[PDB]
Design an enzyme around this catalytic site. Structure first.
Site, short mmCIF file in Angstrom:
data_model
loop_
_atom_site.label_atom_id
_atom_site.label_comp_id
_atom_site.label_asym_id
_atom_site.label_seq_id
_atom_site.Cartn_x
_atom_site.Cartn_y
_atom_site.Cartn_z
N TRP A 71 0.83 -1.19 0.00
CA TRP A 71 0.00 0.00 0.00
C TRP A 71 0.88 1.26 0.00
CZ3 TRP A 71 -1.67 2.58 5.02
CH2 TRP A 71 -2.76 3.40 4.80
N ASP B 170 -0.54 -5.22 9.77
CA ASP B 170 -1.51 -4.27 9.27
C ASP B 170 -2.64 -5.20 8.89
OD1 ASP B 170 -3.18 -2.44 7.77
OD2 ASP B 170 -1.46 -1.53 6.88
N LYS C 195 -13.40 -1.14 6.07
CA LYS C 195 -13.80 -2.00 4.94
C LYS C 195 -14.71 -3.19 5.33
CE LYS C 195 -9.47 -0.26 4.21
NZ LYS C 195 -8.25 -0.13 3.39
C1 LIG Z 1 -7.31 0.66 3.82
C2 LIG Z 1 -6.07 0.25 4.43
C3 LIG Z 1 -5.67 0.78 5.62
C4 LIG Z 1 -6.33 1.81 6.46
O1 LIG Z 1 -7.68 2.16 6.20
P1 LIG Z 1 -8.54 3.24 6.93
O2 LIG Z 1 -9.44 3.87 5.81
O3 LIG Z 1 -7.76 4.36 7.54
O4 LIG Z 1 -9.27 2.43 7.95
C5 LIG Z 1 -4.46 0.32 6.14
N1 LIG Z 1 -3.76 -0.64 5.49
C6 LIG Z 1 -4.10 -1.18 4.34
C7 LIG Z 1 -3.19 -2.20 3.77
C8 LIG Z 1 -5.30 -0.72 3.75
O5 LIG Z 1 -5.68 -1.23 2.61
#
Ligand SMILES: *Cc1c(COP(=O)(O)O)cnc(C)c1O
Ligand SMILES: *Cc1c(COP(=O)(O)O)cnc(C)c1O
Lengths: 396, 396
Positions: B130, B211, B246
């Site tokens: 990411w 994560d 999500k």
């Molecule tokens: C979406 C995501 C997050 C953090 O999402 P938030 O919208 O702040 O809850 C963190 N790590 C990964 C790998 C993600 O895809």
């Protein structure tokens, strides 16, 4: 990696709460809180934000990400509250507002931006000031300096010491101003002093950072921003960290704004791209609910009128106990004269007590207050008043 | 101070949205989004969180500050979701959870804590990963390194290159693991590899940072945490940044957690005092609404059952289009074999396209995707499927 020695230390006001609940005895009075409380001791949800919350339940259809800088509506409602409707600043597109998590949230964003994109190395905060200011700024790599403000004696603003001390600042130094009077002292500048300080800063090259968290609690929403606007008239660039925690009573929803002004729209957009880069690397984008409540009320004539009646009741209530505490202190004996409490604006005031009258007041009298003698008059009510003024006369 | 030169640059995926709305033409398909979407193209509020929102409107009576680490209920609902009900970790009081603004919010808090209280200087993230991971960690003064993961060819996890590359890490280095498969690739470890990596880390001295943002989207809530729990069995200390954006579809309310585990309760409390010191200097305390919704549903048997049916529908829907995209690609011509799409978990997948098939697909075909070829299959529906697979066959 963490096993054995890392560290500690307790927050000044925040650790004083865990001995408020623990005390059995009848009397127990907590001044030393940081929120508003009504004549019955509760911090209620405002009638106006409950109405905007029912609106949001029925209307919202998605919970999808907000842009990095939040809800547009919120941003201009803020600009119009901070600066006025007809301001050269808004019509000239000189200001950009990021919706941010609480006013502290806005200060850390002023801080990371400044620390990373600017040449700023020191910021000057008042003595005294809100203790969490040193931490926010030190966490962004910036050391903090202090300018005189009170010292003590006359119980007023020591104007000449703040300036004789502010001259030790160089030109890319930030000086943080409290817009709406001062935490912890409740002490102003007068409008003639805000004008005397706005010119100084224009001539020495300071960049002002206004922390504005209690707008509406001193004389009214407009009068409370005249310091800010007296500087926004004179400045090319400025920063303000505003908060809607204490005026919309929206405390745990974390609702604030970080407004950046820059000389023209083309500059402020380049600058604000980096402010948005700062935010993306912290929490990514701001919490929708509370800001969605502030923007629904500020843009609805019905709703915004109920809110303003509710801010005028809180404001009138605090004024009442400033008026009533200094009277009960007279008719309850009282050694010293406390006339200074009235016109000292907002929720907090320095009671004048020593760091020994406070601990005597707390161990076996039940009145809580911050060791620095800072009291919250919104923690004062009519039938807890004379138990409290009595306990204070008992220690001088 | 800001007038003339500061800077820019656009976010990889976030700048691709402002040319989605701008396109007139019929066909326009946005894959390259980051949220879930249902068979009709909307990101609806979950039935379950609308019910918990009506509960909160009727029940809440104050909006007063949350503690620095949030709502207790939330914290243990999280610990039980991440680790299981009967875990040595919970009964032994080895873990502390701060309620945080989104999963990014939790990573910046892992970051500031680590950067300031620990000897950690580098963190190792996967290639690819990411993109906002480098910024969060660099903003905390930490430089980022990369461990092999995919490279490309076989369209799978290159297990031996990730390990031959992870050996260049020393012992107070953090290695960040994606718990629930991988953004951007959707590629796992198998349980036998998560076990093979948990021992390695125990023997080399890495401190794992999981994560975990898409729990519930690969096989189910429990199966998705078996990697994590395979390491939590072997480790003394670990960190996890979980997110409820999500899976509760609670995206703009900013709902996440930062869990710290330490070897024993006395250590984890000393460590967590500094994690709370970190937070106080950022946003002060977390947003109540979304976390209040997650804790009301997870603690109500009725409500939590409607939520789990809703997470199983999203999860089943994404699986469906992985299944259906690879079939429409066969019966629409299709040059290359796309069988790899199925069992590649979650919303995102690398389509395999070059950074030239994407720009050909976007300029005059209307399909949007991220230049790296990353597609969001939740942006795929049944009646936008054959326009999309057709456009892809047209470019190979
Ligand atoms: C979406 C995501 C997050 C953090 O999402 P938030 O919208 O702040 O809850 C963190 N790590 C990964 C790998 C993600 O895809
Ligand atoms: C309360 C306060 C803030 C910030 O408040 P939030 O609870 O984060 O909105 C900032 N500055 C001062 C001087 C304050 O008193």
């Amino acid at each position: 990696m963490f096993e054995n020695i890392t560290a500690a230390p307790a927050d000044p006001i925040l650790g004083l709460a865990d001995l408020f609940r623990a005390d059995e005895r009848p009397g127990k009075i907590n001044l030393g809180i940081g929120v508003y409380k009504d004549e019955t001791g509760k911090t209620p949800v405002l009638t106006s934000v409950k109405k905007a919350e029912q609106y949001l339940l029925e209307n919202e259809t998605t919970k999808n990400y907000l842009g990095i800088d939040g809800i547009p509506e919120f941003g201009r409602c803020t600009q119009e509250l901070l600066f006025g409707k007809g301001s050269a600043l808004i019509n000239d597109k000189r200001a950009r507002t990021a919706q941010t998590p609480g006013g502290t949230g806005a200060l850390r964003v002023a801080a990371d931006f400044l620390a990373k994109n600017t040449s700023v190395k020191r910021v000057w905060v008042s003595n005294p000031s809100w203790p969490n200011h040193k931490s926010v700024f030190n966490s962004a790599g910036l050391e903090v300096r202090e300018y005189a403000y009170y010292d003590a004696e006359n119980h007023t603003l020591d104007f000449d010491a703040l300036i004789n001390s502010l001259n030790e600042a160089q030109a890319g130094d930030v000086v943080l101003f409290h817009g709406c009077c001062h935490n912890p002292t409740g002490i102003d500048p007068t409008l003639e002093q805000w004008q005397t300080l706005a010119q100084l800063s224009v001539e020495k090259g300071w960049l002002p950072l206004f922390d504005f968290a209690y707008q509406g609690f001193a004389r009214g929403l407009e009068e409370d921003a005249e310091g800010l606007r007296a500087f926004a008239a004179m400045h090319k660039e400025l920063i303000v960290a505003s908060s809607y925690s204490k005026n919309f009573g929206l405390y745990n929803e974390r609702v604030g704004a970080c407004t950046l002004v820059a000389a023209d729209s083309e500059t402020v957009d380049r600058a604000f791209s980096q402010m948005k880069a700062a935010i993306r690397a912290n929490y990514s984008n701001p919490p929708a609910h509370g800001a969605s409540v502030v923007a629904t009320i500020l843009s609805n004539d019905a709703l915004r009128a109920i809110w303003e009646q509710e801010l005028t009741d809180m404001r009138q209530r605090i004024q009442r106990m400033r008026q009533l505490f200094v009277n009960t202190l007279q008719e309850k004996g009282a050694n010293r004269d406390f006339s200074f409490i009235i016109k000292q604006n907002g929720m907090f005031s320095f009671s004048g007590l020593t760091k020994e009258q406070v601990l005597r007041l707390r161990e076996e009298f039940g009145v809580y207050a911050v060791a620095s003698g800072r009291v919250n008059v919104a923690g004062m009510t009519p039938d807890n008043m004379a138990p409290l003024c009595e306990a204070i006369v008992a220690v001088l």
